[PDB]
Design a protein around this ligand. Structure first.
Ligand SMILES: CC[C@]1(O)C[C@@H]2CN(CCc3c([nH]c4ccccc34)[C@@](C(=O)OC)(c3cc4c(cc3OC)N(C=O)[C@H]3[C@@](O)(C(=O)OC)[C@H](OC(C)=O)[C@]5(CC)C=CCN6CC[C@]43[C@@H]65)C2)C1
Ligand SMILES: CC(C)CCC[C@@H](C)[C@H]1CC[C@H]2[C@@H]3CC=C4C[C@@H](O)CC[C@]4(C)[C@H]3CC[C@]12C
Ligand SMILES: CC(C)CCC[C@@H](C)[C@H]1CC[C@H]2[C@@H]3CC=C4C[C@@H](O)CC[C@]4(C)[C@H]3CC[C@]12C
Ligand SMILES: CC(C)CCC[C@@H](C)[C@H]1CC[C@H]2[C@@H]3CC=C4C[C@@H](O)CC[C@]4(C)[C@H]3CC[C@]12C
Ligand SMILES: CC(C)CCC[C@@H](C)[C@H]1CC[C@H]2[C@@H]3CC=C4C[C@@H](O)CC[C@]4(C)[C@H]3CC[C@]12C
Ligand SMILES: CC(C)CCC[C@@H](C)[C@H]1CC[C@H]2[C@@H]3CC=C4C[C@@H](O)CC[C@]4(C)[C@H]3CC[C@]12C
Ligand SMILES: CC(C)CCC[C@@H](C)[C@H]1CC[C@H]2[C@@H]3CC=C4C[C@@H](O)CC[C@]4(C)[C@H]3CC[C@]12C
Ligand SMILES: CC(C)CCC[C@@H](C)[C@H]1CC[C@H]2[C@@H]3CC=C4C[C@@H](O)CC[C@]4(C)[C@H]3CC[C@]12C
Ligand SMILES: CC(C)CCC[C@@H](C)[C@H]1CC[C@H]2[C@@H]3CC=C4C[C@@H](O)CC[C@]4(C)[C@H]3CC[C@]12C
Lengths: 1164, 214, 218
């Protein structure tokens, strides 16, 4: 669907409504400017053909006709300026209003809108959709009107000069319109066809580049490479056919134009010889009507662009038309004055609109008084965060009524209520400004003294003092520059600066140490006496000193009372407390050196295509020189027939040679792009995981490099050799011939050819539009939008949208002025290079009359020099426009050859190394330090050590991100540590073979990822370089207890699975990951988070195959669920990388340490 | 081939009358362009032909308005009104409409005038010719009209000789008269044998001389 | 004005090869179609050949094609006609003629050039003075003659006193007899002219390089 036309120009004022009307009138005038030139030129050639009478008064008459040409030139100068300037100004101002209103509408949106609509889609639709609207209401509409005016002027001038000859053109004119329409529609950046061809291979590229570590883990690079190559060859085939047909179309356009010349002259000489028309009358009519018919097709991309703009405006306007159910832009709600903390919930049933079939809540009733510290305890899934979100009115409850000190929310203001409730969420985000602004983000008017007070209440002033720019430090994106503890404490301060009336903490001390959490809680109890408070966390240290503790079960608050009340109640909380106690190099031709025959044929055909322009200049001059000589009717009839036949033969040659040049260069270019994509992708795969770490080149840079290199390198190689050759042939022959024929006129015209060529280029660039507008500026503006869509979760709490929209507008204020000036400049350059042609006509034919009068050259020679040098410098402009840039192509080639010759640490195709015939299975790590390359200043390990024997079920337990999967990567050769020693059965991994190690063991990743194929080819990814038997495919499925969910689906072993397994559930993809690794039969096995999303009955059937297969092979399981940790052989707890405790489980349970506190979570 | 045939072969016209020639073609000349090309040419005695009407009823630059052409289909005509003596020669009708270009035969135009009589003058053989063994007596009959006149050589008063040579100029455009020469050529011995030589134009006009030398 | 002059016509034995040249001044030679036309001794005009303005197209009639060949040299402004396999019926007077806009075929004719194709041998003329007996006067006027006789081929030039005497002259057309030509001319001058100052009969026969000025004597 698409908008109306009245609803596209919705943001148009009286000033924008004037610009469009006057630009439309000026475009009509500009349009009619050219057929009048052909009328004057036809009338002028009769002054030169009847000049010599057996030359007096030739220079007077050429003076008058120079005035005519210069008057038309001035008229077109003024009208073309007005046209382009006024349409680009109307579009610019309107697009500005649309950008602002679109973003302002995105801000006033219900929560969860972003979950429904991905935020890369919002951030991309923003820019793409506004550009797609801008294109259609800009100068494309002016060009449309200009071409309709040219059409009508052409046919009126035609029919007025002579109707008999115009009717014949009009009979063959629809074919001309179709030829031109098809040509320009094909021409309007036919690049999306290549994107549509490469879409599927890009899908494979994005799959493999989402799970690079996984594919490297299984070692199956070759399989994914075969897949990419198959997709690639398909796209290559489609491209070859597209080149064939596009070039056939250009060829038939040229054939039709030339055979039209042939017919026009064959019948026009019949009319001239009969005495009815003259030769000027025939030139007038033929050129007027031909130009009108071609101008109708020069306006076909405008209807396309307008349809696309209409389509995109529909989406945007629909986004800005919806009004959510809650919005801080409505002042209807009443603001209270005497603020008193009181919470009343009663019969509160609520469900998430994202998944409304499930009901987490089934009514909660609660009454909380002022200052009453209420804690809520329960497992993750009851919805503590759901209650926190329910509080601030992020949603509305489906049943009941909620109230805060008497009256209900549903009749009072959302903004006022939102500001007085200081809330901290589970995972805070921090804005990438200075920290002073971050803490200022509480409210508007906060001075530095209050800032210091709040930061000293947060006890986060030490790391403020040790780091430079103590109030000027720009924190990185998503709080990466500082640590987690500092970040959470300053987030607490950021909440406190608002001076709230109700405080709501949710997991305020997730990764916090002892003394900082203690001082934080002391400060929290320093500012709780005037404010209501609700705290949600896991640590029971900051819970025992509360007012009232409650307990969630199935969303329902079941237990109520104080501490001793739930002690004597002996419930789940009693169980809890009972258990707790730079350069650029040229090698681009060597890349394409295998396809030499295509280039030989292509350069030959390009030489001919360049020569076709002077040949036409010569034939045209000679036909018009048949009627300036004093010959009989038989001589004129025979010579006219000869030259009309020559027009036809030149048409056929043009058809063949255009087809051939296009086809051979296209085939060579497509072979080059397929080979380049293949080689680059194979090189990417052969890079280890350490190269991919770089945030520049992890996901987007590589896929954009594939889809950019493809086009660019064929651009350089084909453009250079074809355009340089075609234009050398064309202009060189033109200028040499026109020098031997007349050298004075040639020297005069040789000063005007630059402007004619560049005029062609500026016009064609106007036809293609603008690829990029205000790039730097668009970055400056879109950074704000990115950081405002990413931090939406936080910013709806902070209620700082207004203060964010103003930042957006301020960021827009520079590109706006820049764009209006750019329009006023482009209008001038376009109008001047358009009028230059009329002035060139005038100057050349006044000089020509002078020469002819002094008998220094003939008329036919003036006409030949003019046609070869001027009619044939426009062609240089067109050809040079159509060619793709060489600078971007050459830098792209530099990057491609960098990636191609790129040499990684270890070679994947290297079998060299220690290859023992036997192994033992014992591993030993000692004093092993690991620092991430991306984070060289932050150490995650401190020289850990381990000892592993055969069959030893070694468990690893710790906090999140403490070096859990680090030991996994440190075994699987992803990272080699700077210091340490790793003995694998007395064999150091650095001297062994690199594929053998990765071949012997087998693991399950943290998150299961499956490939775009059936489940059969998902499990048969585990064993490669080997013939997989289906009896092991069903065996591994029965063993993993997925055989039931396979044998149930239609096309059981050929059911096509979505990307990452988005079709089936998390438990099944976790099982089929267990079965994917099960077929490996590894002598060393690792498990990371083996029971993340799995049922309780499914864990026993998963582990039962593990327990029976644990024997013989070393086993290492890392999980959070204690069930697999109790039965393990030995357990190793980590703390910031350091091995704290190690030994048998009983020895760890005898001496109570930190592991005892880990066992004390929920048992009893 | 298409052949043009002009109706009068000779045409005599009083000074001041009207003269009409017609040139009927044989294949109804008309080109493929719908133009019919049919021109008239006039050759005055002793000069190259000159253009006169480059199609049916046009007129060449310099040609008086007395000449007019008019023709249709396969019959064309030329009419002159108030002939003069200057307009005196042969009129050809050229047609360039078909692939061999053909002229017509011609129509001699002769202006009538008052009969004049020749100034006759006889001349004796020169010394140089007598030495070589020859004798030619020459008699000019100048500025007379009409053309038809007879000259009779008399040798020694009675010998009407006949071995003579005659040659007519064309009608003179100035006075419309004629002339002609009569040359009696014989041997030096047959001449010496006689004394009196008489030239007689045809009341004839006589002229004579008496000697072999004086 | 347009001046076309022609040259190159002389006697030729049958089967021989001749070449005629016609030089054109006063117009732009390289713009005009040009033709050769021919006038027989019965005085019947016949078209001979046509050539277009570049030199591309040439048109001959069936009678003459194959043997004759027309060409033009646009740099020297010259028109040439080459003739081969001559015949007796190709004996005539040849004119070059220039084409006219508005489509008239021969606007400006040149002077003739006379071409004879026979076995007759070149023979210089015999010039004889003609005066009255003993210088006898005929009143206020005197008529003098001059007789050229026995020459071949036809072209012969006769003037009086290098062209000074032109008013009262009567040259008579040549008469062929026994493969020889005979021509005569008369002048009429006042009696106070000839006996006072003598009158010279200038005769030239280019075929034989003959050139004789015979004074008339009493
Ligand atoms: C707004 C910028 C501008 O208007 C563009 C462009 C150039 N301008 C000047 C105005 C102009 C055009 N024609 C003219 C003819 C006489 C005087 C002025 C002009 C033209 C036009 O028609 O606009 C409506 C045009 C012309 C050619 C052109 C593509 C082109 O644009 C569509 N050709 C590329 O090779 C050549 C041609 O072969 C072609 O069109 O092939 C794609 C073209 O044959 C036809 C049917 O046009 C032709 C004959 C007109 C043949 C030989 C050379 N001559 C020179 C180039 C060419 C033309 C307009 C300014
Ligand atoms: C139709 C719209 C979009 C444009 C208006 C067309 C204009 C440019 C038309 C309207 C009337 C037209 C004129 C009508 C009369 C004549 C007289 C003739 O001897 C030459 C053409 C000429 C001079 C025409 C030129 C084109 C013209 C001026
Ligand atoms: C777009 C299409 C349908 C237009 C229709 C084609 C017309 C314009 C074509 C078809 C046949 C053609 C006509 C055939 C016969 C003649 C008769 C002559 O005395 C003038 C040309 C004229 C009149 C032609 C002019 C062009 C013509 C009328
Ligand atoms: C459809 C397109 C591609 C080609 C259409 C060609 C038609 C419209 C053209 C091609 C040849 C043309 C004909 C060419 C010759 C003549 C003879 C002339 O004295 C009258 C017009 C007439 C009869 C033309 C009428 C229109 C005509 C038939
Ligand atoms: C598809 C359309 C636009 C093309 C129309 C057909 C053209 C190519 C045809 C139509 C009539 C044809 C002409 C018909 C007659 C002759 C005479 C001959 O001695 C030379 C070729 C010549 C001059 C032809 C050239 C080709 C020609 C002009
Ligand atoms: C003997 C001489 C005068 C021959 C004339 C050769 C000229 C016309 C040739 C020689 C160099 C050629 C240029 C070489 C490089 C390029 C740069 C490219 O971005 C557009 C084509 C362009 C601009 C060519 C245009 C044609 C050109 C200028
Ligand atoms: C003196 C002789 C050689 C004159 C030849 C004209 C030269 C100077 C003209 C002819 C065509 C012109 C080129 C036409 C188009 C382009 C493409 C554009 O992206 C850069 C300018 C460039 C490269 C022009 C530079 C100047 C140029 C090469
Ligand atoms: C925009 C800039 C480059 C203006 C260029 C304008 C040129 C092309 C125009 C301006 C006015 C014009 C001139 C106006 C007057 C005459 C006087 C006459 O005796 C010769 C022609 C001549 C000399 C014209 C030729 C072209 C001309 C010089
Ligand atoms: C091409 C455009 C941009 C401007 C070029 C203008 C040239 C073509 C114009 C400007 C000056 C003009 C000259 C102005 C006056 C004279 C003097 C005389 O001897 C006749 C012609 C001559 C020599 C003109 C020829 C045309 C001319 C040379």
């Amino acid at each position: 669907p698409t908008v109306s036309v009245f609803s596209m120009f919705r943001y148009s004022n009286w000033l924008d409504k004037l610009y469009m009307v006057v630009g439309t009138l000026a475009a009509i005038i500009h349009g009619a400017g050219l057929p009048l030139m052909m009328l004057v030129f036809g009338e002028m050639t009769d002054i030169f053909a009847n000049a010599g009478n057996l030359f007096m008064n030739l220079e007077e008459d050429m003076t008058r006709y120079a005035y005519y040409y210069s008057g038309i030139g001035a008229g077109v100068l003024v009208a073309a300026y007005i046209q382009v300037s006024f349409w680009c100004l109307a579009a610019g101002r309107q697009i500005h209003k649309i950008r602002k209103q679109f973003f302002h509408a995105i801000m006033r949106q219900e929560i969860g809108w972003f979950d429904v609509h991905d935020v890369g889609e919002l951030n991309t639709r923003l820019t793409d959709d506004v550009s797609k609207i801008n294109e259609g209401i800009g100068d494309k509409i002016g060009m449309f009107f200009q071409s309709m005016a040219t059409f009508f002027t052409g046919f009126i001038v035609g029919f007025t000069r002579g109707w008999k000859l115009t009717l014949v053109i009009l009979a063959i004119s629809p074919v001309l319109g179709l030829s031109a329409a098809v040509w320009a529609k094909i021409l309007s950046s036919f690049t999306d066809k290549e994107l549509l061809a490469y879409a599927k291979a890009g899908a494979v590229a994005e799959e493999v580049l989402a799970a690079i570590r996984t594919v490297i883990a299984f070692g199956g690079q070759k399989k994914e490479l075969e897949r990419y190559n198959k997709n690639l060859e398909e796209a290559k085939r489609i491209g070859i056919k597209k080149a064939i047909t596009a070039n056939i179309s250009i060829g038939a356009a040229f054939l039709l134009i030339y055979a039209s010349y042939a017919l026009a002259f064959w019948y026009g000489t019949t009319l001239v010889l009969s005495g009815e028309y003259s030769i000027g009358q025939v030139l007038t009519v033929f050129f007027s009507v031909l130009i009108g018919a071609f101008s109708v097709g020069q306006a076909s991309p405008s209807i396309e662009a307008f349809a696309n703009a209409r389509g995109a405006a529909y989406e945007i306007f629909k986004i800005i038309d919806n009004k959510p159910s809650i919005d801080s832009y409505s002042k209807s709600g009443h603001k209270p004055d005497n603020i008193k903390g009181n919470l009343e919930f009663r019969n509160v049933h609520f469900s998430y609109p994202s998944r409304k079939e499930v009901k987490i809540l089934k009514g909660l009733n609660l009454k909380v008084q002022s200052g009453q510290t209420v804690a809520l305890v329960g497992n993750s899934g009851c919805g503590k965060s759901t209650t926190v979100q329910l509080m601030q009115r992020l949603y509305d409850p489906t049943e009941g009524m909620v109230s805060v000190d008497g009256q209900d929310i549903r009749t009072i203001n959302v903004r006022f209520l939102r500001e007085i409730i200081g809330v901290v969420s589970q995972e805070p985000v921090l804005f990438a400004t200075t920290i002073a602004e971050n803490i200022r983000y509480g409210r508007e008017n906060v001075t530095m003294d209050e800032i210091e007070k709040a930061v000293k209440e947060a006890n986060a002033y030490d790391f403020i003092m040790k780091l430079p720019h103590k109030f000027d430090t720009l924190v990185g994106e998503r709080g990466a520059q500082l640590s987690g503890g500092q970040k959470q404490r300053i987030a607490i301060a950021r909440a406190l600066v608002r001076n709230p009336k109700i405080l709501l903490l949710d997991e305020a001390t997730s990764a916090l140490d002892t003394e900082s959490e203690a001082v934080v809680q002391v400060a929290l109890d320093k500012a709780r006496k005037g404010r209501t408070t609700i705290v949600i966390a896991h640590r029971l240290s900051t819970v025992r000193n509360a007012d009232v503790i409650a307990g969630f079960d199935d969303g329902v608050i079941v237990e109520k009372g104080n501490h001793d009340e739930l002690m004597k109640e002996k419930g789940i909380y009693f169980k809890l407390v009972t258990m707790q106690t730079p350069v650029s190099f040229w090698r681009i031709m060597k890349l394409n050196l295998t396809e030499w025959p295509y280039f030989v044929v292509g350069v030959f055909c390009a030489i001919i295509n360049g020569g076709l322009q002077p040949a036409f200049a010569i034939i045209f001059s000679k036909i018009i020189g048949v009627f300036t000589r004093i010959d009989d009717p038989e001589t004129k009839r025979q010579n006219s027939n000869l030259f009309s036949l020559l027009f036809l033969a030149l048409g056929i040659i043009s058809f063949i040679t255009f087809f051939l040049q296009g086809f051979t260069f296209g085939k060579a270019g497509e072979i080059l792009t397929k080979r380049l994509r293949y080689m680059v992708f194979r090189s990417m795969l052969r890079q280890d995981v350490s190269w991919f770490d770089d945030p520049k080149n992890t996901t987007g840079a590589l896929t954009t490099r594939l889809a950019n290199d493809a086009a660019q390198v064929k651009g350089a190689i084909g453009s250079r050799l074809a355009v340089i050759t075609q234009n050398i042939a064309n202009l060189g022959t033109g200028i040499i011939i026109s020098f031997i024929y007349g050298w004075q006129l040639t020297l005069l015209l040789l000063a005007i050819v630059p402007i004619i060529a560049i005029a062609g280029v500026v016009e064609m660039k106007m036809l293609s539009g603008q690829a990029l507008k205000d790039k730097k500026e668009l970055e400056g503006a879109g950074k704000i939008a990115t950081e405002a869509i990413e931090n939406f979760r936080t910013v709806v709490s902070l209620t700082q949208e207004q203060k964010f929209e103003h930042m957006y507008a301020q960021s827009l204020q520079v590109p706006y002025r820049n764009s209006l000036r750019k329009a006023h400049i482009f209008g001038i350059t376009f109008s001047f290079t358009q009028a230059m042609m009329y002035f060139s006509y005038a100057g050349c034919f006044r000089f020509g009359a002078y020469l002819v009068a002094h008998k220094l050259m003939s008329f036919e020679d003036v006409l030949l020099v003019f046609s070869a040098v001027v009619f044939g410098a426009m062609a240089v402009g067109q050809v040079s426009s159509f060619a793709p840039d060489y600078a971007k192509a050459k830098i792209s080639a530099a990057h491609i050859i960098m990636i191609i010759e790129k040499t990684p640490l270890i070679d994947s195709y290297s079998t060299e190394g220690l290859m023992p015939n036997t192994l033992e299975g014992n591993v030993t790590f000692g004093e092993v330090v690991f620092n991430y390359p991306t984070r060289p200043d932050i150490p995650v390990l401190q020289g850990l050590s381990l000892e592993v024997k055969k069959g030893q079920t070694l468990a690893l337990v710790g906090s999140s991100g403490c070096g859990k999967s680090t030991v996994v990567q440190l075994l699987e050769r992803f990272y080699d540590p700077l210091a340490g020693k790793v003995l694998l059965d007395g064999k150091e991994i650095k001297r062994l073979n690199v594929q053998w190690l990765r071949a012997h063991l087998g693991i399950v990743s943290q998150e299961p990822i499956l490939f775009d194929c059936s489940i059969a080819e998902n499990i048969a990814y585990g064993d490669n370089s080997r013939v997989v038997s289906q009896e092991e495919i069903v065996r591994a499925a029965k063993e993993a207890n997925i055989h039931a969910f396979i044998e149930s689906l239609p096309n059981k072993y050929s059911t096509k699975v979505g990307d990452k397994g988005t079709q089936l559930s998390g438990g099944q993809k976790q099982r089929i990951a267990i079965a994917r690794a099960l077929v490996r039969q590894p002598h060393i096995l690792l498990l990371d988070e083996a029971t993340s999303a799995l049922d309780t009955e499914s864990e026993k059937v998963v582990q039962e195959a593990l327990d029976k297969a644990r024997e013989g092979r070393t086993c290492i399981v890392i999980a959070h669920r204690l069930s697999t940790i109790q039965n393990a052989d030995l357990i190793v707890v980590f703390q910031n990388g350091r091995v704290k405790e190690h030994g048998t489980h009983q020895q760890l349970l005898a001496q109570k340490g930190i592991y005892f506190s880990m066992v004390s979570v929920q048992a009893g | 081939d298409v052949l043009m045939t002009q109706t009068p072969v000779s045409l005599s016209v009083s000074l001041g009358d009207q003269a009409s020639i017609s040139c009927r073609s044989s294949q109804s000349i008309v080109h493929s362009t719908g133009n019919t090309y049919l021109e008239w040419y006039l050759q005055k005695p002793g000069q190259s032909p000159k253009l006169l009407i480059y199609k049916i009823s046009n007129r060449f630059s310099g040609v008086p308005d007395r000449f007019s052409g008019s023709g249709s289909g396969t019959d064309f005509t030329l009419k002159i009104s108030r002939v003069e003596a200057e307009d005196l020669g042969v009129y050809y009708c050229f047609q360039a409409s078909h692939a061999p270009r053909t002229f017509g035969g011609g129509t001699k135009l002769e202006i009538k005038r008052a009969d004049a009589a020749p100034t006759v003058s006889i001349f004796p053989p020169s010394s140089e010719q007598l030495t070589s063994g020859g004798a030619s007596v020459v008699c000019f009959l100048n500025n007379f009209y009409p053309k038809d006149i007879n000259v009779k050589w008399k040798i020694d008063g009675s010998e009407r000789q006949n071995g003579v040579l005659n040659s007519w100029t064309d009608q003179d455009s100035k006075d419309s008269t004629y002339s002609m020469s009569s040359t009696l050529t014989l041997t030096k011995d047959e001449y010496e044998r006689h004394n009196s030589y008489t030239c007689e134009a045809t009341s004839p006009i006589v002229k004579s001389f008496n000697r072999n030398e004086c | 004005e347009v001046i076309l002059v022609e040259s190159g016509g002389g006697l030729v034995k049958p089967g021989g090869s001749l070449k005629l040249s016609c030089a054109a001044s006063g117009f732009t030679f390289s713009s005009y179609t040009m033709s050769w036309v021919r006038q027989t001794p019965e005085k019947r005009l016949e078209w001979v050949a046509t050539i277009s303005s570049g030199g591309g197209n040439t048109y001959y009639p069936d009678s003459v094609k194959g043997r004759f060949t027309i060409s033009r040299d646009n740099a020297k402004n010259n028109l040439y006609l080459q003739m081969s396999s001559l015949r007796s019926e190709d004996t005539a007077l040849y004119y070059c003629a220039r084409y006219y806009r508005y489509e008239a075929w021969f606007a400006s004719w040149g002077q003739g050039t006379l071409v004879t194709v026979s076995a007759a041998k070149t023979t210089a003329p015999s010039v004889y003075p003609l005066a009255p007996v003993c210088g006898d006067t005929t009143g206020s006027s005197v008529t003098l003659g001059c007789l050229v006789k026995g020459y071949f081929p036809e072209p012969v030039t006769l003037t009086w006193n290098s062209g000074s005497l032109s008013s009262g002259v009567h040259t008579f057309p040549a008469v062929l007899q026994s493969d020889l030509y005979t021509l005569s001319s008369s002048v009429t001058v006042t009696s106070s002219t000839w006996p006072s100052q003598s009158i010279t009969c200038n005769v030239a026969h280019p075929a034989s390089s003959t050139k004789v000025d015979k004074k008339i004597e009493p």
